[PDB]
Design a protein around this ligand. Structure first.
Ligand code: 1VU
Ligand code: 1VU
Ligand code: 1VU
Ligand code: 1VU
Ligand code: 1VU
Ligand code: 1VU
Ligand code: 1VU
Ligand code: 1VU
Lengths: 161, 161, 160, 161, 162, 163, 163, 163
């Protein structure tokens, strides 16, 4: 097939239906996220989603929230559909999302990871060492007591894509 | 009777008299809080009140001020009228306010609690450990020095109502 | 005379000529300050000045800069005119400034004081012990090597 | 005939061409930074550039990002064109930048200087001893590669120009 | 270095605003016997203009004047140069620019009050104690001063002053 | 108490002002009986005239009706009256002071008036004199020369406060 | 029959007003045969001129043409005529009285006019004097000085009912 | 050989008028060489000025630049010139007469001008006198002085056709 990347969000019909498809993949791959909570965040206007499309069908995505006053982005949800995982799609999504944030000159990623996702973010260059000060993210990024906070710092000079 | 909840504010005649109704309950149940000060805030545009209506009549409410630039909300007055207390009206009021704040992406409450109501705030999940940075609120919330600063974190995945 | 207190600032002819009177009084009483620096601050939109008027003319005031997101107010200029000093006017000015900030939930004054005025700030409750962390005020207040950083702590009050 | 203009992409052909010209001098004198990255910053509305013009033509400039919410300005690019160096143009540029900043009530400069240029900043008054809290700049100023963080404190009573 | 002349007045942006403060300062300081508030009232009066002498962005002198086109003259209200810039010909240069300005606006008479300590400066600017303009034309329009000498200057519009 | 001062006049439009103007017409007229009431009403309600009202507890207790001649560089004082049971308390002097401050703001620094014999002492205490410096060509025919009245002039000082 | 007085002129229109101005130009010209009809028509239709028309049974039987100079504080009387069959019945005097009442209510108190020899006695009886109180600088070159004519002035009392 | 007269001025003006004012500035410049040509241009193009242009075959051959002061009741004569090859043919007199006729219809009846030895005799033949009836207070600081020049006045009669 042919693969497309598209940053979208609920600020168009294909956008709306692509968003419903993202809420489906997020809900299926993250069974502990209440479905209504996914849809509330995914359809929220100051959230954006990097969609991974295969033949006009939503097969993955990274839902994120830019905090340019506080100088970082929240990674909200990460999913590739089940039969399309372990093929590098996750890595091309993250790399794409990184180059986009270069172009908007935000250079920091914050996210919470459970024990089953920590390996993925580590392999995208995320660390437990948080350089961003608490005074800047607490109360803006959604806390997850029980999961590890991870951070990734981008180089506004190297080609990610 | 017929119980209703409404987040009102002064930014209808029906709403005007509900605000006077809330200023009345707040004043009676907080008798050393100067009435003019209670009126000044309840009729302030940047403050809002969650009225509890029973059979068309105001019997309770929580008056608050959301600081979405700082990520928390300040709780200002809580009261139920004398002959409706100890029936759970307090709890449903707070639960409703939690739900209102989930849907508005503000997940932290801050309040001062006197020696007469800290047991209520404890039972609504408020703690003396403030996880919000002192710098986030020191210039925003009024300091009722003498009373105890208390904090409530909201889980946006749990249903509260 | 008729004594008035007004908190004014550059966004009206009356306010305007009051800011010029204030710049006059700050400049004449602090003559090693550049006239153009005082004027640039007094007419800065995010500074305010508490003007003390006696019979429609400025006789003193306090120019300040509030930092709400930081929990204090910087005190930039304090002057009373020469022929009206030693009369409690400096104390009424600072007192009014305290009430203003107690309404507005700012409970801390920060200021640099020199050897000619440090006693007057002491008498208004300033000390050399700075309880505001350096991380809250550094880079926000104009640091002045050679003068003494001093702090005043206000008691909060419920209106009426 | 020498002129100094603070310019930038607002929200004018002579302005637009000067910005193409600055972007060229920055690209040529800072070979490390990718030309595409220099353009996004020089043409960003939140960034400004102080242009040094010698007979209608750009020979130097300083690209800066003001953070008045934090009390400092980031100095992003410094360059004088090779044919015009060691003629005191860099000092005249930094002086005008200083005057521009005392009129705008910002009194700290923060920059990352590579080992090759630390001597120049040192002679414009910069120090390696950083009086701003780390928590105040981390994530706003682009952390640079291997460069030294430097700070310049301004005194709003000197006429720098 | 970097001398400029600007006719400004209060209609004001903050550059013009801060310059009027500078002028009011220079006037106030060189005219100690004029009340600061009176100088400020007139400098910021809309029907008043000031020719500012700007030296490297900073005010160092000026002439505050008030044009009376229907009366056919202009009132010279305040002249001052900062103490450390006096006796370099700056005062003369201000007056010449003010004469060139009024030639183009077809006002060819200046009226001013000078005290014994200022008569010599206006004399060397071409002013005279012989007042050709009639009293009916200026009395109660220009602000009289007790003890000051009234002085008049007549301009030639066929002569270039700057 | 609650003394107020208001400069009012017919605009060539408000009922509070209109009843105030009638109060002034009455006070002027009762204090100046040998002046036609119609003439006093005509001037008070004339648009290019103005009156400085002295309000005490909402009721008119005095005022000064004047005509500004900005083109001629002076203002004419037309009527001055304080109601009888409020005289000799400084109200006539406070009225003249406020009227002075008002004119300094409009760069009119000369008052002219034709005082009758009963008023000369009041005008003298407010700084008027018989030595008229405004040349006759500037005021003649613009103010009426009532035979037997005394032309009196007051010069205002724009550097000094009057209120 | 029905006598009316109307102050008219050629403004910035009415068919009745316009025929009256012809009637006035006719009366002035016939009663002043030694002034050129063309000149009488220029002034009578000049917009800065006004005529107080005496109307009897809808017909023009006389009038006064004047030029108000409010800036200079006087009015110029330009032409006075009553048609011959209606002279010596007080109409000339009523016109002047009406003209006086009109200027009183407009705050103008001085009339000026250049009378010829045959009109001195009429102006004398209407209160004019050869003794001119307005300074020469106020009227020279605003009113027209004809050689051989007598300047005459009338001073108006605004406290006097003229009509 | 077809001669016209037009009152033109820089109205704050089409192509024809603009090239005529430039002509007039050229002619005034050549015939009055002690006047800076930039001074003639400033006044000739001044909106408060006007010029009576003498046009012969579409070509400017003369004119009179004048400034009307209606509040003052006179007009200043600023420049008079006829081109050299058209002089002493009565052109300068038709110009002054056309200008007199223009001014009576605008109710201005005095002319003031400065003239040195060379020009004085021209103005005398147009009826100017060295005896000024306009008082000094009316024209001083309104008309441009020239020392070395004689102030001259001319009185116009509005019962007279000048052209
Ligand atoms: C944003 C807030 C969050 O934390 S959401 C939590 C993350 N989301 C989920 O875990 C949902 C379930 N997982 C998935 O949908 C996918 O496996 C995700 C995590 C999106 C990765 O997509 P995928 O298409 O497999 O990408 P990929 O082929 O590039 O694999 C990357 C390499 O990393 C390694 N890895 C180690 N641990 C993991 C892990 N838990 N999930 C995925 N990959 C992991 C894999 O070996 C893989 O290959 P390699 O190591 O580069 O050779
Ligand atoms: C924000 C600043 C403030 O306003 S602080 C002051 C709060 N307001 C007052 O004190 C006003 C007077 N009191 C009241 O209006 C009500 O009692 C308040 C405190 C609002 C509670 O409403 P109410 O409907 O009675 O409570 P509820 O039935 O939902 O009971 C919930 C549980 O709380 C417990 N509790 C312990 N201490 C108190 C207390 N001081 N007041 C009320 N309840 C208290 C009750 O026992 C009850 O316990 P449980 O559910 O049986 O486990
Ligand atoms: C914010 C940075 C600054 O502005 S620091 C510079 C302050 N300004 C100056 O030094 C300019 C010249 N001085 C002044 O304008 C006035 O003296 C100032 C300092 C404003 C005080 O106003 P003033 O009304 O005269 O004083 P006050 O009558 O209210 O007296 C209050 C008590 O303070 C005492 N005091 C001790 N040292 C001083 C001093 N240097 N200047 C003035 N007062 C001082 C007075 O004795 C008086 O004592 P007490 O109340 O009798 O116990
Ligand atoms: C983060 C912002 C950045 O751009 S960091 C990298 C700085 N930019 C570069 O290195 C680009 C290439 N160089 C240039 O464009 C110019 O030479 C720069 C560095 C801007 C200086 O301007 P320029 O006109 O040459 O300097 P100037 O004539 O005003 O001389 C001032 C004094 O500085 C001294 N200096 C010491 N080290 C250096 C150095 N590495 N480069 C330039 N000047 C340096 C010079 O000797 C000069 O001498 P002195 O003060 O009389 O002793
Ligand atoms: C109240 C009404 C008003 O208009 S204010 C009255 C005048 N104002 C003042 O005196 C204020 C204080 N004085 C000053 O600010 C300046 O000295 C003034 C008077 C403005 C002159 O400016 P300044 O730059 O010094 O003059 P300049 O360098 O062009 O010198 C020109 C020549 O004038 C002569 N002169 C005679 N008397 C004076 C005098 N009182 N002040 C200054 N110069 C004066 C000087 O000899 C000077 O030199 P020279 O004659 O050309 O060789
Ligand atoms: C041009 C307008 C006119 O028709 S001239 C008419 C002026 N009005 C009248 O004559 C009306 C009758 N009188 C009044 O209405 C009031 O008395 C007037 C004149 C307005 C003064 O008001 P009133 O408030 O009483 O006066 P005041 O208390 O402010 O001042 C009183 C001081 O003035 C002195 N004075 C000397 N002669 C007179 C006088 N003829 N009328 C009033 N005051 C006069 C008194 O000695 C008294 O002296 P002191 O300064 O109070 O100690
Ligand atoms: C220079 C350009 C002008 O417009 S000169 C203005 C005068 N007009 C003329 O001379 C033109 C022809 N005359 C007339 O139309 C009328 O006679 C004029 C002058 C307008 C008078 O109108 P008429 O209706 O007669 O007035 P009137 O009846 O009110 O007479 C009042 C008393 O005035 C007396 N009077 C003394 N001298 C004269 C005189 N020269 N012309 C007219 N009346 C004059 C008469 O005796 C008459 O009677 P009595 O004195 O009350 O008993
Ligand atoms: C600021 C001052 C001003 O308003 S401009 C001052 C005058 N302008 C000039 O002198 C410019 C050069 N001269 C000319 O352009 C013309 O010759 C002027 C003066 C405008 C006359 O026009 P022009 O067409 O030649 O005259 P005209 O034929 O209508 O009449 C000629 C009659 O005038 C007599 N005259 C006596 N003295 C002079 C004189 N100085 N200039 C011209 N004419 C003069 C001639 O003898 C001749 O006499 P007559 O009337 O025919 O019997």
């Amino acid at each position: 097939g042919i693969i497309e990347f598209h940053v979208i969000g609920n600020s168009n019909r294909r956008v709306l239906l692509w968003l419903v498809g993202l809420q489906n993949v997020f809900s299926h791959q993250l069974p502990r996220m209440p479905k209504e909570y996914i849809a509330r965040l995914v359809f929220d206007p100051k959230h954006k989603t990097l969609a991974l499309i295969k033949d006009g069908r939503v097969i993955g995505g990274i839902c994120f929230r830019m905090f340019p006053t506080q100088g970082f982005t929240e990674i909200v949800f990460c999913a590739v559909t089940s039969n399309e995982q372990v093929k590098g799609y996750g890595t091309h999504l993250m790399n794409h999302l990184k180059e986009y944030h270069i172009k908007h000159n935000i250079l920091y990623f914050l996210t919470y990871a459970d024990e089953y996702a920590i390996g993925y973010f580590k392999k995208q260059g995320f660390s437990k060492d948080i350089k961003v000060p608490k005074s800047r993210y607490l109360g803006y990024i959604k806390d997850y007591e029980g999961a590890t906070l991870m951070e990734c710092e981008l180089n506004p000079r190297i080609p990610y894509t």
